[model samples]
Target: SAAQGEPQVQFKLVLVGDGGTGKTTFVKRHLTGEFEKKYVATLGVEVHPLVFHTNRGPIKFNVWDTAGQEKFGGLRDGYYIQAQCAIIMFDVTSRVTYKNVPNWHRDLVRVCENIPIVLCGNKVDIKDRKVKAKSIVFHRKKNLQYYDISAKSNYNFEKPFLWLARKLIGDPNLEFVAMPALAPPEVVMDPALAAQYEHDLEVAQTT
Candidate 1:
């Protein structure tokens, strides 16, 4: 057990998912207490550091958010190389995005073997969710923690990271200060716009 005045522990956490699945929004909410409205695809990788002051001590998380476009696939290994764990996100509104979870998992393991991973279904606040109970069962079968979260509403936003922290530190009793809440306007991406983004993503990946 760490002493009362133990130093902070740092961990490298990586976020991976298909484009437009809300990876950037999730990170932004946790780091800045705000949800971004504009949609700009991640080009390569964005790194952010968050310090959670917990009962055990301060835990510094170096979060690496990776671009989901296939064009940036080659750079993923480098991002995952030193990662202690990862969160694989999929949009609840997009069946196609949810279907790609396995491929993302396989790729993560290829480079960062035996690392803890959490499966997240984003946009749960949206009414027309496509990923359902069977998907949760599948994640359980693979022994990964699963969460239904909404970055816009701040719903269950802290649970995944808190769970990861406890796992990494081997302290089930760990506790952290409450996470901040920022209720941004609801995200409503038109189907046509989403399709166009998906098309562009495919083009980038292939060429």
Candidate 2:
């Protein structure tokens, strides 16, 4: 029953952020069988095997998603165990969450070094966002490749995985064979607001 025709490789991906940063909601968008994308984030830890097809074959990222505040606070280290790549997310509407980026990064670096790490500012569709694109200089400082995204709107949802795949697989030339199906947006993103942010992103690129 074994076949090289279906070659598959696997890697660990750590998903981390403070509580209520929508880490679970972000991962839930990739679920197909569940078909219940509309729900609150759950507690403790969960592992999700997210697969993406490629020219070479299929690669699975076993995402270690932490939703609740660690029962023991700093004991969240266990979730980072054996992780190969990572995504650090924060809520754009909350400045403190964005301020806590280094705390998450510092701990992640302690567990795994030199791995591909994506810094994502979530809930980008919110009108009350406090963290601006220019304020995302933290990514540039550590080379974390910042991507502002909206989990509900499905805006730029493919980027984090795509960027991590390139770094982990060492093939910047690699492209997606087929993108995974995701749930419909829970809320609509204003095009004017989106365009404004795009302009801000462009300006940030220059700074």
Candidate 3:
């Protein structure tokens, strides 16, 4: 029997991206609130469990941090098995990393179709950003949510996970009591791209 008011639902969340995109750091920050300054590539998959207390109920996340290196290609499909949700991350400073996003998404879809997924642009705190918010058009087209976040600065770090939690629990109405104050505010959309996203959003809503 489960404890009263305890988390009843558990979701397996996986993170995938190109090597050096900071996926491991993001997971470390979220799980322990400490940033690892050093960079170490995940060899295969590292699993971490995170429990969150939400308005709907307590939810436990079994987070899988997968290797981004091509050498580990053989191990990817096995990891996607039974994953309930996923986060596709990219390094905003690296155009190549951003370009590889579609491949990652496609692989995930092939293994786990129709699962909730979020697109994250990591390393936003860096001054040199090659990927702009206008790129969010990819999100609109794919029908996925997009977020700009900094794993190093812990900016807007909780929103993605919380959004996934709400989605998995089938409770979109479960809103955060207070929005987390993002340092160097999350760069969502550039003014140049705002109108485009707005139009896309409108069309999506009506259709």
Candidate 4:
């Protein structure tokens, strides 16, 4: 059990991607259980102070979710504030979102020059291939970790967050303590598929 005394390590976990990329859905998967519904009507940018219990202790990341402000107009100053680390996602079923990933990355880099960033291709459970692994070059080019995830099916959900947490803690071995208790999954990822994509994720890092 995490001690109630230690000052919880807090960091700004910036979540950015184009509209309709299910950015809200991704964060909702890590919501406080047994509480009200997790979804929020993101208009400008919604901040979710999310906590994850690690072996070290409970750490918090005030996640910033975009609400069509940057893609539409009204480029607010607080759009991507205090992004100590970030996760930029794209809908794998949509090619447009994949193409615009660089734009999102560049914009975030302008704010937080050098920080641990994890890039995700969301909706991997969808039976469509609008984007492919070989095409996922931006993350490698920019030195950011990459993973294909399905926010709905809870596929590789914690990987992005876990990777970010490890980098921020400056400990390669930092891991969650008893974290496999999130929710009844909407869809169960196949063992073969998970292993296959996990292979792709590993290969992409080298490629």
Writing each residue's lDDT as its tens digit, candidate 4 over 1-207 gives 345676668887778888889888887776563233233454355677777888887787777766666567533546666679998989988988989888888888887899999999988887666787877788766998888888888888788878998999898999988563566579877778778877886787676
Off by over 4 Å in 1: 1-7, 32-43, 71-75, 180-207
| lDDT (Cα, 0-100) at 57 in candidate 2 | 70
Each model's lDDT comes to 0.72, 0.82, 0.71, 0.78
Worst 10 residues of 2 by lDDT: 33-42
Q: Going through the candidates in order, what is the number of backbone clashes in each?
A: 0, 0, 0, 0
| 1-207: candidate 1 lDDT, tens digit per residue | 545766557888878888889887888875442232223244456666766777866787777765555534444466678889889998989988888888888888888888888999888767676776444454655778877777886666777888888999888988887654344535644556445444653554344
Best first by TM-score, ranked: 2, 4, 1, 3
What is the C-alpha lDDT profile of model 3 across 1-207, one tens digit per residue? Answer: 346765357888978888789888777764332221222244356676665666655566777875555535534567888989999999889988888888888898999999999998888777667887655456667877877777877765787888897787788777655333333333443444445544654665555
- Candidate 4 residue pairs in backbone clash: none
Query: What number of backbone clashes does candidate 2 have, counting pairs of residues 3 or more apart or in separate chains?
Result: 0
> Residue by residue across 42-157, what tens digits does model 2's lDDT show?
43566777877876677788777664664236435567778899999999999988888898999999978888899999999988889998888888879898888999988888
Model 3 TM-score on a 0 to 1 scale = 0.75
Find the number of clashing residue pairs for candidate 4: 0
Least well predicted 10-residue stretch by lDDT in candidate 4: 33-42
Instruction: Show model 3 residue runs off by greater than 4 Å.
Output: 1-7, 32-43, 67-75, 176-207
Q: Arrange candidates, best lDDT first.
A: 2, 4, 1, 3
Better of 1 and 3 by TM-score: 1
TM-score of each: 0.76, 0.88, 0.75, 0.87
